Design a protein around this ligand. Structure first.
Ligand SMILES: [Mg+2]
Ligand SMILES: [Mg+2]
Ligand SMILES: [Mg+2]
Ligand SMILES: [Mg+2]
Ligand SMILES: [Mg+2]
Ligand SMILES: [Mg+2]
Ligand SMILES: [Mg+2]
Ligand SMILES: [Mg+2]
Ligand SMILES: [Mg+2]
Ligand SMILES: [Mg+2]
Ligand SMILES: [Mg+2]
Ligand SMILES: [Mg+2]
Ligand SMILES: [Mg+2]
Ligand SMILES: [Mg+2]
Ligand SMILES: [Mg+2]
Ligand SMILES: [Mg+2]
Ligand SMILES: [Mg+2]
Ligand SMILES: [Mg+2]
Ligand SMILES: [Mg+2]
Ligand SMILES: [Mg+2]
Ligand SMILES: [Mg+2]
Ligand SMILES: [Mg+2]
Ligand SMILES: [Mg+2]
Ligand SMILES: [Mg+2]
Ligand SMILES: [Mg+2]
Ligand SMILES: [Mg+2]
Ligand SMILES: [Mg+2]
Ligand SMILES: [Mg+2]
Ligand SMILES: [Mg+2]
Ligand SMILES: [Mg+2]
Ligand SMILES: [Mg+2]
Ligand SMILES: [Mg+2]
Ligand SMILES: [Mg+2]
Ligand SMILES: [Mg+2]
Ligand SMILES: [Mg+2]
Ligand SMILES: [Mg+2]
Ligand SMILES: [Mg+2]
Ligand SMILES: [Mg+2]
Ligand SMILES: [Mg+2]
Ligand SMILES: [Mg+2]
Ligand SMILES: [Mg+2]
Ligand SMILES: [Mg+2]
Ligand SMILES: [Mg+2]
Ligand SMILES: [Mg+2]
Ligand SMILES: [Mg+2]
Ligand SMILES: [Mg+2]
Ligand SMILES: [Mg+2]
Ligand SMILES: [Mg+2]
Ligand SMILES: [Mg+2]
Lengths: 63, 136, 386
RNA sequence: AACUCUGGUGGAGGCUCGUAGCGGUUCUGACGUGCAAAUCGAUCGUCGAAUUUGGGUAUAGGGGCGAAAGACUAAUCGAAC
RNA sequence: CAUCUAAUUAGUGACGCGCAUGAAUGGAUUAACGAGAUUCCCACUGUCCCUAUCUACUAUCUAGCGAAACCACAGCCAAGG
RNA sequence: GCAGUCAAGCGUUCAUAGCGACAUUGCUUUUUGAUUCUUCGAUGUCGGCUCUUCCUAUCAUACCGAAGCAGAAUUCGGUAAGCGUUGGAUUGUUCACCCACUAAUAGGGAACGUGAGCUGGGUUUAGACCGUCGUGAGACAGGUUAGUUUUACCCUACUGAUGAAUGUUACCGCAAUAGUAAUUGAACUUAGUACGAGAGGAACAGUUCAUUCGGAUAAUUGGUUUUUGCGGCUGUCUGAUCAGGCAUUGCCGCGAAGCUACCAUCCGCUGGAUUAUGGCUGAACGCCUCUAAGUCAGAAUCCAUGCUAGAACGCGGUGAUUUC
């Protein structure tokens, strides 16, 4: 019973939610939802998407 | 599927019908595999025989060595690139479609698989799992 | 000449006619075989379908690849308040079938079940059972006479129950009234059980247990007039075709010079009464209970209701049946849950199920949080003074 | 040495891409008791000349006219009305 | 026969005692051109596997207006003749 | 095309395990001949696609009998049409042939099923080229290329939908009848066991999955997006700002809800009576014999349980039944 972390948004993934993507260099990317999956597939940087965990700790939002 | 398979398989979503060209993961000298059939397929009118991960397919080689080209040969699908659900709830998919050349008894023609391999394929075919590196 | 390429027949010829059901409450056409040794108990129970959610549990299936591993499963939640018992009905075997011999009603009926007898309740004088309630006058002689008739005759005893729909997040206010056959022995003991339980409520934990196969009898979701491709599953005709491709192209030979009943045609889809068997009860949950959505492995004090209510239904404040998979009927709909008509011992039954986690994330979106406390702990504080 | 090469200039062509225009390939789309006794939509061919076209004039039925299909000659053509 | 394919009554390259090829009733070839006919490859795609969904306008119901084709009489079958 | 009778013979011996000459007797209308009986004041002419039903002359599946049946695999046959019977290259093809999967890729009918269902590839009304024939106009069941596929709103049939009458009205039911549905495979185990000199090599019970079909459902994943929900972007217009208009839904990204997908999940019941066949008791026929009387087991069959509709002229129980 494991809660994963979304590789784009840092969102907590409960069982069943979102998808898992295995890249050509076999790196596992877990996505909580299709929003994160599509933004990853658009090659968007999570550090510039203003609601992600990576953005908020890069900008020191709420700490 | 038939002979060589070590166990059963839960149903994986079919993503590779006939006519699908997948990459050739092993080092046997082929570059792609063109799926001409699926072993253990179902006989329904108009319905294409469709493969999924871990399935043994009949395949030709469209790009590769001339000694592998223009022949029918068995292959095993090792990567699917179509989203399928595991019974642990995880809908996963790969980046590309990939298979390895084998003989009908399941032993693999090549010696080393380049890339990840699905866990159902590795558990169904021990010769794929022996030469596989990372599994999923 | 022949078919040239054999294919299976589209659709099922035994689920015909594909028409609208006579009512929303799909009738139970078979109750379990009466074992006359067991105690007297209901064989069905009435609920309202709240919605589906997701569980995680360790699968105990030896020989399976997922033995002692966690499986993620869909469950249907049936919001299930206790039913009130308001009558009994006696059934006499005749050479033309069962025959209702007499009904005996309880003395006081609530306005929920009194509303069932009225098409315009707001206008009425509400005079229903006002002279039946005078049959209980000074010794209940005319009631004990009819109950003695049910004891003397009446090889089958059914009880009249009604849902408590004001305990349910529905705008309907009008109860659903149904006969449930009393299994459990001695026709006298069945009538005595019903007479003790007049005006009393029977809860769902007295009917159903966990790890029990049950049957779901419900009218399915209505889909209007539908064409033959989505009604029957027929192949869409090729793109070049004239006058339409969501059709059946040949609806019969020249001879017989008639369209056959077995030719797939357009018409009503959905709103059909369906019985679907062998759904495993994963939780008999209590309404006087927080930690409905908590398991022994979770221990997060949360109820079965998702964040922001069950979508298009409401929130569950009553007892409920969490059952495995999909049952017929859409949400808000009356559903009859019935005990199994056969003793199933197939090792998919008889399996003790312990839930590890129940999904209470919002079904109104792609919800990420299980509790508002979890939302607060993740998101931190907000501009609204969170 | 006969003479070669390069950069500009220039603006030719029954040349090209493509509007208007002129046609009418495919959908064998729509319509098919039609908007229409031949249209509508998309897609097309061509678009500076053997071009497109108005007005005037000439050729009349076993006759005309025809870059030729027995085509066209007033919804009439293997002989108009 | 070869090649193209896993497989080709298709395509291409050859062979030629060619039912019945052939030299301005033109023979062979040919760059460019072609809404011509054909084959393969890449790209691409609901052509398909295998169908789903959305929009507008219909259809539908209403107020108004209001035809036509067709019509011996009509309208449930099975078998017999 | 498919059967049957006789049995010289083939089958190491041995007519009939399996075949079977010379004869001979039949079946079917799924080929083709024969007729010209209906249609010439239009029965739309092949093939394919779609979809339904029917037949059994059974390919597979179920249960069995026989073998030159040791096992495995086969071969012959019985009940049996319940349930399936494919994906492709070439060709307009039906047919063929090959690749390949499969339990199996059985044969047929339904106006050579099915064109107001489609398509128009074939035959082909006018165009055109060739070959041969003809002096020629022209001919060719010779090749090639192009060639308008119209109408339902009527009756019935089918599919769904109402509905007068039953004193009225409402609730809860019964179930006559009609339909009915599940299908098949593999891996593990039995077990390298039985059987066999070996080579080889099973089955039943058990368990886990899968094929095809069906009925739902939308928690999840995917799809859809006029939530024109939020953001962005181009061009223009509102003097700039803010906020907007138009671009026949302007475009791009995300997008709840709803609908939906073997592209997602769930679910798909067990009793009885039988066929083939193998038997029991037992005469006829003092013996024998499954059969004659009687009787046992037994198929994917049949009928029920279960499921769907409920007779709108089938029925029941129950509530209330109108004046100041
Ligand atoms: Mg097809
Ligand atoms: Mg057939
Ligand atoms: Mg069928
Ligand atoms: Mg019943
Ligand atoms: Mg609807
Ligand atoms: Mg719809
Ligand atoms: Mg219809
Ligand atoms: Mg459900
Ligand atoms: Mg939702
Ligand atoms: Mg020019
Ligand atoms: Mg040009
Ligand atoms: Mg132009
Ligand atoms: Mg002009
Ligand atoms: Mg047209
Ligand atoms: Mg029309
Ligand atoms: Mg008009
Ligand atoms: Mg003249
Ligand atoms: Mg001519
Ligand atoms: Mg004219
Ligand atoms: Mg080809
Ligand atoms: Mg050639
Ligand atoms: Mg030209
Ligand atoms: Mg309208
Ligand atoms: Mg309208
Ligand atoms: Mg008459
Ligand atoms: Mg008749
Ligand atoms: Mg006539
Ligand atoms: Mg006609
Ligand atoms: Mg006709
Ligand atoms: Mg037979
Ligand atoms: Mg047989
Ligand atoms: Mg039959
Ligand atoms: Mg049938
Ligand atoms: Mg025909
Ligand atoms: Mg017809
Ligand atoms: Mg037609
Ligand atoms: Mg043609
Ligand atoms: Mg109408
Ligand atoms: Mg059955
Ligand atoms: Mg469905
Ligand atoms: Mg404009
Ligand atoms: Mg706009
Ligand atoms: Mg299905
Ligand atoms: Mg005896
Ligand atoms: Mg017998
Ligand atoms: Mg007898
Ligand atoms: Mg018996
Ligand atoms: Mg039973
Ligand atoms: Mg009735």
């Amino acid at each position: 019973m494991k809660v994963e972390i979304d590789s784009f948004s840092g969102a907590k993934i409960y069982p069943g939610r979102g998808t898992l993507f295995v890249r050509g260099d076999s790196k596992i990317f877990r996505f909580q939802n299709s929003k994160s999956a599509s933004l990853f597939k658009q090659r968007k940087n999570p550090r510039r998407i203003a609601w992600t965990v990576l953005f908020r700790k890069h900008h020191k939002k709420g700490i | 599927s038939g002979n060589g398979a070590q166990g059963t398989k839960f149903r994986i979503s079919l993503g590779l019908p006939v006519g699908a060209i997948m990459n050739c993961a092993d080092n046997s000298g082929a570059r792609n595999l063109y799926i001409i059939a699926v072993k253990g397929s179902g006989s329904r009118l108009n319905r294409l025989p469709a493969a999924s991960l871990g399935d043994m397919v009949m395949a030709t080689v469209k790009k590769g060595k001339p000694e592998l080209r223009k022949k029918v040969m068995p292959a095993i699908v090792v990567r699917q690139a179509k989203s399928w659900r595991r019974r642990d709830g995880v809908f996963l998919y790969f980046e590309d479609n990939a298979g390895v050349i084998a003989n009908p008894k399941g032993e693999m023609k090549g010696s080393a698989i380049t890339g990840p391999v699905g866990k159902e394929c590795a558990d169904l075919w021990p010769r794929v799992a022996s030469n596989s590196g990372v599994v999923v | 000449s022949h078919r040239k390429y054999e294919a299976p027949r589209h659709g099922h010829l035994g689920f015909l006619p594909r028409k609208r059901a006579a009512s929303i409450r799909a009738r139970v056409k078979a109750f379990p075989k009466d074992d006359r040794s067991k105690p007297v108990a209901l064989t069905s129970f009435l609920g309202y379908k709240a919605g589906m959610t997701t569980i995680v549990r360790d699968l105990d299936r030896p020989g399976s690849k997922f033995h002692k591993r966690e499986v993620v499963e869909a469950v249907t939640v049936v919001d299930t308040p206790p039913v009130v018992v308001v009558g009994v009905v006696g059934y006499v075997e005749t050479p033309r079938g069962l025959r209702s011999l007499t009904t005996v009603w309880a003395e006081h009926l609530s306005d929920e079940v009194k509303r069932r007898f009225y098409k315009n309740w707001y206008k009425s004088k509400k005079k229903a059972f006002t002279k039946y309630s005078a049959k209980y006058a000074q010794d209940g002689a005319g009631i004990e006479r009819e109950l003695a008739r049910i004891k003397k005759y009446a090889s089958v005893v059914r009880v009249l129950v009604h849902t408590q729909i004001r305990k349910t997040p529905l705008a309907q206010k009008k109860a659903h009234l149904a006969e449930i056959q009393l299994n459990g022995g001695s026709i006298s003991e069945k009538v005595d059980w019903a007479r003790e339980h007049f005006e009393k409520t029977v809860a769902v934990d007295s009917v159903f247990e966990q790890n029990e196969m049950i049957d779901a009898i419900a009218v399915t979701k209505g889909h209007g007039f539908e064409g033959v491709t989505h009604r029957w599953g027929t192949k869409k005709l090729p793109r070049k075709t004239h006058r339409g491709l969501r059709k059946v192209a040949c609806i019969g030979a020249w001879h017989p010079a008639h369209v056959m009943w077995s030719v797939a045609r357009a018409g009503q889809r959905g709103y059909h009464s369906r019985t679907s068997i062998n759904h495993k009860i994963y939780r008999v949950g209590k309404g006087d209970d927080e930690a409905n959505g908590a398991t022994s492995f979770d221990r997060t004090k949360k109820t079965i209701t998702p964040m922001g209510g069950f979508v298009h239904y409401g929130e569950i404040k009553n007892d409920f049946i969490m059952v495995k998979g999909c049952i017929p009927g859409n949400r808000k709909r009356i559903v009859t849950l019935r005990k199994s008509l056969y003793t199933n011992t197939s090792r998919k039954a008889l399996e003790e199920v312990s839930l590890k986690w129940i999904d209470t994330a919002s079904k109104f979106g792609k919800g990420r949080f299980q509790t508002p406390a979890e939302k607060h702990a993740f998101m931190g504080t907000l501009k609204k003074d969170l």
